[PDB]
Design a protein around this ligand. Structure first.
Ligand SMILES: [Zn+2]
Length: 616
């Protein structure tokens, strides 16, 4: 309960600082060719060519049966593919006409606008069932807002903004109808319906708030700034949006870590960024949270979590492969003054020149024009401290100058997209995973619900952890780490994992600690049991070519990198193959990965283990 936005301003403040008549718009007038040419640079010929490919595009109708099919079989794409094709065509035509300015794409822009007004709804078939009737087919008497419609509305709102005058010379009824449509589909419902789930008014402990909140609020805000010219109404809308986005800010951890990982980052933190940018532009910079430390940390998480060559930290149900929109990361970094994020975005270009963002997100497409020149000039660098420590999320990243990156966590077995992974770690060498975290599989019916933890990728058994007295970690809020420390100077992470295990595990304490020096990672386990009932087992997950050249040495060679894992000789080491049937995994790891199991006949109440990993 920080309520940063409500603290920065109330409705009265708003009315005083809002900029009317779209005077906040940062792009040249459509008629201002010279300014368009300077801004566009070599985006110009590129966008013109993209536009030219759409001069005979046939606007796709979406049939009733395409919406009905979501109820019949679960099929989303039958409806979404034509929808998105139309939305991308309209977005591209907008950029091409800005680029050229000779009227050549105006007729297709007009067609696209008009057809969109004729559609009963801009809501995806998969989301329409939130409406009162609970059906997947649009109900012409009612509109809700979803991720799609919000974006559709904002795009239409921008097309109205740039092309009203040429449209009106052709026939003023087109722009009239667009204003009515955006009113019925965005403005009205946004103001009149308090109960949309992603707005999070009336939010209750236990309910979820997620990326839908800053994403939909950012799209709504644009529609208001572009289309609502009554200031009393506008101030009320904007204020409503700040109270709504305050709920998201409130729920997010202050340390800046996105515990869903980097593939939500873009539409989570990145749409919070978008929202604050639009809110700042809309108030002449007077209502801005972009200087807040927390916002900078949310941005930088993308940088710190990105190991290299596509590989990212992937605690929880998250892909080990990752990436980002470099242009967005730049604009975010510039806005919160992170040179790290700006250098990072240039590194993420992989030596390409930055061009306009295409797709269907008007705001991002337009904003990408403003940033291309500067990002093109930025020096590519992925620098960062040796240690990043997120104390509230309990994620610790530690690196050395000879290519080792370790990610470790404390936490609790009820995070978003939870894996039972209190205490785990991941090791990368020159960006390549060497001790890995499997990550996300294809969804089944067992994925949510009891039985979630019957899927192997969610079990502690298949993370880099012990089975204490042969027992794994248990799912649940109070199965958790205690006394997690990170000593940033010495690169020591340490946590007691005992409480993440159930009573059957009969453990008092188990301290799992990671130390990273310039050449090597040392893992230690120091444990006290209530009763020695079964041998403990220690597991490590890996891939490539694994060899066992003597007791207790394992060598791992993968993608050019080579390590040795030194383990206590009381342990017998075995390698189990895990043939990957699931494409969502085999597309990251290939055909198979391995669990190294370490098993003993010894049983005692007290013990410690040391393991050491170094390059060779
Ligand atoms: Zn995992």
């Amino acid at each position: 309960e920080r309520d940063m936005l409500q603290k920065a301003a109330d409705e009265t403040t708003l009315k005083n600082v809002l900029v009317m008549k779209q005077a906040w718009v940062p792009y040249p007038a459509y008629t201002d060719r010279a300014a368009w040419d300077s801004l566009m640079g070599s985006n110009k010929q590129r966008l013109i060519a993209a536009g030219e490919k759409l001069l005979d595009y046939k606007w796709q109708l979406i049939p009733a049966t395409a919406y009905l099919e979501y109820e019949r079989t679960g099929n989303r794409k039958i409806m979404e593919v034509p929808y998105d094709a139309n939305r991308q065509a309209l977005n591209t035509l907008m950029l091409a006409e800005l680029a050229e300015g000779k009227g050549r794409f105006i007729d297709q822009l007009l067609n696209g606008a008009y057809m969109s007004c004729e559609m009963n709804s801009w809501v995806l078939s998969a989301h329409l069932p939130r409406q009162s009737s609970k059906r997947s087919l649009p109900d012409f008497r009612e509109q809700i807002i979803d991720l799609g419609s919000g974006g559709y509305g904002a795009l239409m709102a921008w097309v109205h903004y740039f092309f009203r005058k040429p449209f009106d010379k052709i026939n003023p009824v087109v722009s009239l109808q667009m204003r009515k449509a955006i009113k019925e589909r965005i403005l009205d419902p946004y103001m009149n319906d308090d109960d949309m789930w992603w707005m999070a008014f009336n939010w209750q402990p236990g309910e979820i708030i997620n990326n839908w909140n800053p994403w939909c609020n950012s799209n709504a805000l644009q529609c208001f700034l572009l289309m609502e010219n009554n200031k009393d109404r506008l101030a009320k809308a904007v204020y409503r949006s700040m109270k709504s986005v305050d709920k998201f800010i409130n729920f997010v951890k202050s340390d800046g870590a996105c515990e869903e990982g980097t593939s939500y980052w873009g539409h989570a933190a990145g749409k919070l960024y978008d929202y604050l940018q639009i809110l700042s532009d809309g108030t002449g910079g007077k209502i801005s949270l972009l200087n807040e430390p927390m916002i900078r940390r949310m941005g930088e998480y993308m940088s710190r979590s990105y190991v290299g060559n596509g590989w990212v930290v992937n605690f929880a149900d998250a892909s080990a492969q990752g990436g980002g929109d470099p242009l967005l990361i730049y604009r975010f970094g510039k806005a919160v003054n992170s040179n790290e994020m700006m250098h990072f975005a240039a590194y993420l270009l992989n030596g390409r020149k930055p061009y306009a963002t295409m797709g269907n997100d008007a705001f991002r497409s337009l904003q990408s024009l403003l940033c291309c020149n500067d990002l093109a000039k930025e020096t590519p660098k992925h620098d960062m401290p040796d240690v990043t420590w997120y104390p509230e999320t309990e994620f610790c990243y530690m690196k050395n100058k000879n290519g080792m990156f370790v990610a470790a966590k404390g936490g609790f077995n009820n995070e978003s997209h939870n894996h039972n992974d209190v205490g785990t770690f991941s090791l990368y060498v020159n960006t390549i995973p060497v001790i890995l975290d499997a990550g996300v599989g294809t969804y089944t019916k067992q994925t949510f619900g009891k039985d979630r933890y019957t899927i192997w990728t969610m079990q502690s058994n298949y993370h880099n952890l012990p089975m204490i007295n042969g027992i794994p970690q248990k799912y649940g809020q109070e199965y958790k780490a205690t006394n997690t420390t990170c000593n940033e100077k010495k690169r020591v992470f340490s946590t007691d994992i005992a409480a993440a295990y159930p009573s059957e595990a009969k453990v008092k304490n188990w301290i799992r600690s990671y130390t990273l020096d310039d050449r090597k990672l040392t893992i230690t386990d120091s444990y006290t049991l209530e009763e020695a009932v079964a041998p403990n087992q220690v597991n490590f997950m890996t891939w490539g070519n694994v060899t066992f050249p003597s007791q207790g040495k394992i060598q791992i060679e993968v993608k050019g990198q080579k390590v040795e894992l030194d383990y206590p000789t009381l342990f017998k080491a075995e390698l189990e193959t895990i043939q990957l049937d699931d494409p969502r995994l085999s597309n990251v790891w290939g055909k198979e990965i391995y669990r190294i199991t370490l098993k003993t006949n010894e049983k005692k109440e007290t013990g410690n283990y040391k393991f050491v990993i170094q390059q060779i």
